[PDB]
Structure 1
Amino acid sequence: VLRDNIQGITKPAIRRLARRGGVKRISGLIYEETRGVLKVFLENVIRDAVTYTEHAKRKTVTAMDVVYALKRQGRTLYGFGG
């Protein structure tokens, strides 16, 4: 229950994302690999996104903390800050 939310990313979700990415054929070992990489890509953001929330003395992680954590890593996201 508190361990299988990495498997909440399903096989058709990675299938649809690789169809958007223009991949014609996917092997059976992609789905274990990508769930690793995506998980790492969340950590490197959330480790930063909690940390701004630490410095603001809040408990809510706002959209501005996500925008600042992505802007720090050179992945500037548009359409969430006023």
Structure 2
Amino acid sequence: VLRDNIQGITKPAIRRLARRGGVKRISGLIYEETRGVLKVFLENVIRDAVTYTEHAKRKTVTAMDVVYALKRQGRTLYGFGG
């Protein structure tokens, strides 16, 4: 059964995040909207992450690449180096 990767981010999973976010009741239109939102997040981060990679003349995205991308997106993440 073929199915887009983005649809791999499932209603329950989305629902689980909302729950951790303290969300009680969820319009069924949310799930698509959330997928749009996560795509743009990843798009933004990976672009920069890669731009680092590429700059290093590498073929592998190191965690550092990601950590540095997040940092400049203003989404600093502790724990994976840096």
| Cα distance, 1:2–1:45 mapped onto 2, change above 3 Å | farther
Q: CA deviation at 1:2?
A: 8.3
In the superposition, the TM-score normalised over structure 1's length comes to 0.95
Instruction: Provide, for residues 58-77 of structure 1, a one-character-per-residue CA deviation record: whole Å limited to 9, x for no partner.
Output: 00001000000000011110
Q: Percent identity?
A: 100
Structure 1 segments (4+ residues) deviating >6 Å:
none
Unpaired runs of 5+ residues, structure 2, are: none
Q: TM-score, normalised by structure 2?
A: 0.95
For residue 7 of structure 1, give the secondary structure of its aligned residue in structure 2. Answer: helix
CA deviation profile, 1:35-80 (whole Å, cap 9, x unmatched): 0000000000011011000110000001000000000011110000
Look up the match of 2:63.
63
Aligned residue pairs total 82
